[PDB]
């Protein structure tokens, strides 16, 4: 089997991408944030505290003839940005782009933190990291991909995120028309539960490539590119007037600037992030200070190849017995 679904930016900055997902019988379609940095499929629901729902579409398990309470199971998650959610668990039928999994754990939120409530465009998350990170207790549950894997034509999914435009998530096949050149594959460590890999270096603009190992994670659920402070300083030094602002929370730059590109290495191959992709717009409405899309990871504990980086590439998440990642230009 295969599936193919379009993923759409939630706003004009590509802050996140939403993909429609069919849950239950008859289908309830919710727009979920596909997140290769986590491993829970959780949704706003009829059980979510009413004051914490503000415009999201909810899953109502009592209206699904295939929903079953997973007795005794609870979940609770905290994300790298400080947000969180928790609740109980149903199993139900879940379909993405024509690919159907029966018995998928659907984690129903009883509580969500304010950042989720305040974003009416995201109805929940669909985790695509390794199932070892799933938070369901006392019986850990499998991701949608893990459940689908055995049925897929090939045990892979691909992320093709657009710049200021829709893109595609495919399951079970590589669309050879979706990229240019060849795909370069690179080793993955699953020891922390992430799609963790080592970039071979970077360049700023037209500058020379610096060969250096940068370990990090491919994370579709993080907006920006978070890299070591040395690398980030080298980038922003090429933008007149750019500076790190403790009060804003990162590097800012004059909105009048033209940003240089940023290149990262995948083996001997190179992925170029155009300068435009690094502009996240005014820090507040009407400001001439703009927020940068490359930020320091120093306070995180891990480097993160988020959407800024991934949307410059066609990305293969190869879930074979020994997983690997592939990157192609497009």
Swiss-Prot record:
Disulfide bonds join 255-290. Its EC number is 3.4.23.22. The keyword Chaperone does not apply. It catalyses: Hydrolysis of proteins with specificity similar to that of pepsin A, prefers hydrophobic residues at P1 and P1', but does not cleave 14-Ala-|-Leu-15 in the B chain of insulin or Z-Glu-Tyr. Clots milk. The active site is at 35, 199. GO terms for biological process: proteolysis. Residues 17-328 form the Peptidase A1 domain. The keyword Protease applies. It is an enzyme of class 3 (hydrolase). It comes from the Eukaryota. One of its GO terms (molecular function) is aspartic-type endopeptidase activity. Keywords: Aspartyl protease, Disulfide bond, Hydrolase, Protease, Signal, Zymogen. Belongs to the peptidase A1 family. This is Endothiapepsin. It comes from Cryphonectria parasitica. The lineage of its organism: Eukaryota, Fungi, Dikarya, Ascomycota, Pezizomycotina. The gene is EAPA.
């Amino acid at each position: 089997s295969t599936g193919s679904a379009t993923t759409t930016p939630i706003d004009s900055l590509d802050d996140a991408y939403i993909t429609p997902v069919q849950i239950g019988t008859p289908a309830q379609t919710l727009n979920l944030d596909f997140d290769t940095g986590s491993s829970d499929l959780w949704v706003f629901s009829s059980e979510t505290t009413a004051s914490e729902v503000d415009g999201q579409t909810i899953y109502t398990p009592s209206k699904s003839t295939t929903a079953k309470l997973l007795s005794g199971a609870t979940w609770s998650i905290s994300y790298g940005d400080g947000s969180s959610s928790s609740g109980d668990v149903y199993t139900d039928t879940v379909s993405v782009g024509g690919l159907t999994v029966t018995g998928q754990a659907v984690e129903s939120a009883k509580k969500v933190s304010s950042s989720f409530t305040e974003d009416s465009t995201i109805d929940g998350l669909l985790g695509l990291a390794f199932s070892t990170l799933n938070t369901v207790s006392p019986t850990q549950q499998k991701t949608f991909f893990d459940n689908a894997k055995a049925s897929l034509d090939s045990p892979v999914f691909t992320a093709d995120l657009g710049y200021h435009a829709p893109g595609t998530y495919n399951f079970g096949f590589i669309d050879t028309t979706a990229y240019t050149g060849s795909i370069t594959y690179t080793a993955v460590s699953t020891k922390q539960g992430f799609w963790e890999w080592t970039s071979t270096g970077y360049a700023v603009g037209s500058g020379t490539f610096k060969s250096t190992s940068i370990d990090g994670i491919a994370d579709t659920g993080t907006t920006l590119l978070y890299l070591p402070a040395t690398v980030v300083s080298a980038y922003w030094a090429q933008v007149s007037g750019a500076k790190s602002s403790s009060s804003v929370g990162g590097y800012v730059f004059p909105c009048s600037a033209t940003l240089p590109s940023f290149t990262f290495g995948v083996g001997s191959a190179r992925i170029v992030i155009p300068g435009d992709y690094i502009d996240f717009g005014p820090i507040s409405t009407g400001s001439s200070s703009c927020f940068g899309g490359i930020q320091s990871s120093a306070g995180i504990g891990i480097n993160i190849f988020g959407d800024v980086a991934l949307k410059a590439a066609f990305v293969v998440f190869n879930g074979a017995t020994t997983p690997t990642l592939g990157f192609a230009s497009k």
